[PDB]
Amino acid sequence: EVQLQESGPELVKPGASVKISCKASGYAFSRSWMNWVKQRPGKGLEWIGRIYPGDGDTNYNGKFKGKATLTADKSSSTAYMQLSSLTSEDSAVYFCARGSNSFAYWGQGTLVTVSGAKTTPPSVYPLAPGSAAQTNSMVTLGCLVKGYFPEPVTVTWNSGSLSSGVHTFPAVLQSDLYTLSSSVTVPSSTWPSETVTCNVAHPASSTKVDKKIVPRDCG
Amino acid sequence: EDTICIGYHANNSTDTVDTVLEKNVTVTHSVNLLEDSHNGKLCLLKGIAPLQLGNCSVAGWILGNPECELLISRESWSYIVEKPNPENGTCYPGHFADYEELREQLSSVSSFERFEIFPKESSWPNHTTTGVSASCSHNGESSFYKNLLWLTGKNGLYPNLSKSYANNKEKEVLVLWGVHHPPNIGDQRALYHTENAYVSVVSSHYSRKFTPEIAKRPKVRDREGRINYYWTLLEPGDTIIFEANGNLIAPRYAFALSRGFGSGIINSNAPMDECDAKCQTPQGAINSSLPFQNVHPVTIGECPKYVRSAKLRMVTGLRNIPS
Amino acid sequence: DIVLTQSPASLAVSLGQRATISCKASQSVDFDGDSYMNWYQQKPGQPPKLLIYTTSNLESGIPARFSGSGSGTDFTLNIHPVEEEDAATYYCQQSSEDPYTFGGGTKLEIKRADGAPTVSIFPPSSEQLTSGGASVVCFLNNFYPKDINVKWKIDGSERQNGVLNSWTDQDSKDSTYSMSSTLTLTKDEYERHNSYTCEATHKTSTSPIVKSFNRN
Amino acid sequence: GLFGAIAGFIEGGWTGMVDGWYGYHHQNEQGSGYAADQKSTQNAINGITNKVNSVIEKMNTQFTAVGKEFNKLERRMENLNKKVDDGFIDIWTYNAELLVLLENERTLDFHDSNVKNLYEKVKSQLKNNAKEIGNGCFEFYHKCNDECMESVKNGTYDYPKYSEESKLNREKI
């Protein structure tokens, strides 16, 4: 009932600055310390700094004393964090959390990225079984997501209606463009009997694209 | 103790370039010559938006395939975008003669004037303009091409029609008609009441007489008999005449068109996002400043040359060797 | 500052059994009668969840099979019994001195019965073909353990350049792995062959598993 | 490289001297620092940017390459169209990659030439008033001044003013 909703993923070039936001609701925001934690892919969690939105009192990690700045908006109940002169190592996922000695309630986390390529939305290509052979009562289906630079993509199936064994493989980088795949396992009786659309989203470009998969051709 | 020194600049940029003698050498300053990024949208060339056909083919576009109705009266466009597999082509099964040329001729064009070449009220009185097929459905309702007229007989008769059109429109007009081949001889007797049918279309630069040929055929779209489509571009000032005694689906709406240059046919699934870039590709638009792009081969208007290369960087500075 | 050295780095415990995670410390994490030490659960794709606070206090909601214990320079965490859900990584965290720091992290693997990958291969889409490139994907869903090897043969000749492999972490409700392989060939070179096979050699079978397709 | 100066007897580049590409150091008694040769660096930037602008200019942009679509009975033309498109792309790609791989060396060699040409211009002024020590460095046998440090750069050194003093100190080494 208490939720910290974070901002969207962002992409900036090295040396620039960003504001990341964390809007709070469900509790008395004016009263509990806010927190920021940095998680490099693979490497460990790192605590950044603290804002107390009642008084604006700040604590800064000795490592991050110059890179990060923290503010808050009491009326809007939002927490802002500013990072300056970004380099490669700052490209990570940043979490807003509430608590003083025990980080209790955590945010969603945005993946700010610092590199040379530019924001490009992905193309979606359906993946049909091709051969008309019944491997079992089930047939595996999927969608491929090719050619997109900023990392976050969310692949749902029939607007999330199919939670039955859906896989979303981690993205892989080829010449500065992430590509990944998704799969399902739907009974062969109910496909292509019923519509199986995959819903993908790229929050870094505000692009939502669908593509119902259909069997292949030459028929 | 007291010296002078000659040296060469070094910077912290990691811009890597390839030379003939070695490769992947880091350099002070560089310029990229290859444009490697698109946006995956359908912008507006210059300011004039494209003509998104969507589900329809160019065949269903011109004849007004009743599922293509709302993309009519869009006469101003910069280029036409077709879905790769259009599932609304010709609603009536048959052969579309010289499809590819009309496809190519309708790539230079930039303006139509959809006009009623043969108004139904005053040009086909004796005959029946009420020709509807079940295959050309719309809203679960039988319809027909909204640019032609299925001329059947009225009061059991179907006299020799001899209408004609003079091209008084000062520009090239594109006329479209169709010839009927009923499924069996039984329906041929019922639709037109003549077993010896003919359709001739004659102009100062066109003459082809059509004889129909009634036979058993495989069923397509549930209508066994087939319709064959034909077209001709009338020069300004000539007259086309239509005479027949059966099996003629005559035009009602023709297209007076003015050629231009800069348009073509792209097929892609991109969305339109009102982004006014200087040149388009099926997978988006080009930033357009560089002289080389590898995004896609097919382009529309003042793009760079397409080279299938990974990266082309030119050294502007010199070898970077810092402390 | 204080460094939380965490042991072991990788861990695998069968279902219905106990799992023990140690967390040493450079200094003593004790603060006026309690130890300001916390534990967190981080499933892949999710932010950390708070497990134990102030070195033994279980937070509400999460079940009572989680036990935090320890005092002074070193603490431990118990899970009893380990469930399928617990497939994630766990971190220890001190809150005594500025700056607050986390441990190195440790990944919990659930030991279950071995499995055979259900293999699936898909040809490139027709729209993908128009892009000047094409990619064949070979899905390998629902197997166990990690170790698996995929080989691509174009007309029987094994191809190893241009492959891209990505593994999924354990399913939270299946204790199960998956991975996918992609060849990225040119539009022209894709059309110069017919036989596209991806074979997978796994522990579950002496001979490799094979599924393939042709363009007819 | 080719003239032996870049990555040769000038072993590394100076992380300082942002003023330009080529310059001097002049560690003096008054104060050290950096100062880039405005004359030779303006010729270099004016030549490379003329190279680059010349290269793009020789390639007019292409318009509305759409791709013709042929029917089910014209396979001969379709395969012909592919060759006349893929053929041009084969040429233009190849004809562009080598233009880059070839002229990048000429840009590096041109910098190797300029430094080597500049290093000899300083030598021809400081005939026997200095020696060559640190591979690109000169030792003033006459204790130069900042006035005279600017008096080696813009053609403002002369041996005669300091010659006999230099002649004195050569006799003890």
Ligand SMILES: *[C@@H]1O[C@H](CO)[C@@H](O[C@@H]2O[C@H](CO)[C@@H](O[C@@H]3O[C@H](CO)[C@@H](O)[C@H](O[C@H]4O[C@H](CO)[C@@H](O)[C@H](O[C@H]5O[C@H](CO)[C@@H](O)[C@H](O)[C@@H]5O)[C@@H]4O)[C@@H]3O)[C@H](O)[C@H]2NC(C)=O)[C@H](O)[C@H]1NC(C)=O
């Ligand atoms: C604009 O685009 C839309 C979308 O494509 C079109 O709607 C589509 O129309 C087609 C044709 O009406 C629909 O496909 C048919 O769907 C019906 C269900 O209502 C189904 O009965 C039919 O089965 C046909 O498919 C078989 C596949 O080969 C045929 O072989 C079969 O015929 C055999 O059986 C008969 C038995 O009498 C024999 O006589 C034959 O000779 C043959 O042996 C049968 O005809 C199709 O599946 C399609 O579903 C529908 N789209 C959607 C989304 O539902 C519009 O028609 C189009 N607009 C215009 C004007 O054309």
Ligand SMILES: *[C@@H]1O[C@H](CO)[C@@H](O[C@@H]2O[C@H](CO)[C@@H](O[C@@H]3O[C@H](CO)[C@@H](O)[C@H](O)[C@@H]3O)[C@H](O)[C@H]2NC(C)=O)[C@H](O)[C@H]1NC(C)=O
């Ligand atoms: C262009 O043609 C395509 C098919 O070639 C059309 O796709 C169709 O989209 C409709 C929705 O508009 C789908 O209909 C049904 O929607 C209901 C929602 O209540 C749902 O219950 C069904 O499961 C189904 O989704 C239809 O399935 C889909 N076609 C196929 C073959 O699946 C598209 O709408 C057409 N666009 C235009 C502008 O005409």
Ligand SMILES: *[C@@H]1O[C@H](CO)[C@@H](O[C@@H]2O[C@H](CO)[C@@H](O[C@@H]3O[C@H](CO)[C@@H](O)[C@H](O)[C@@H]3O)[C@H](O)[C@H]2NC(C)=O)[C@H](O)[C@H]1NC(C)=O
């Ligand atoms: C349908 O076709 C019939 C022909 O079978 C048209 O009927 C008559 O056609 C003639 C010749 O086009 C018209 O001219 C007049 O013929 C009479 C014959 O006695 C002559 O005396 C007049 O001086 C004049 O030449 C005639 O007006 C016309 N009759 C009628 C009643 O229209 C008929 O017009 C066609 N259209 C319709 C809607 O019936």
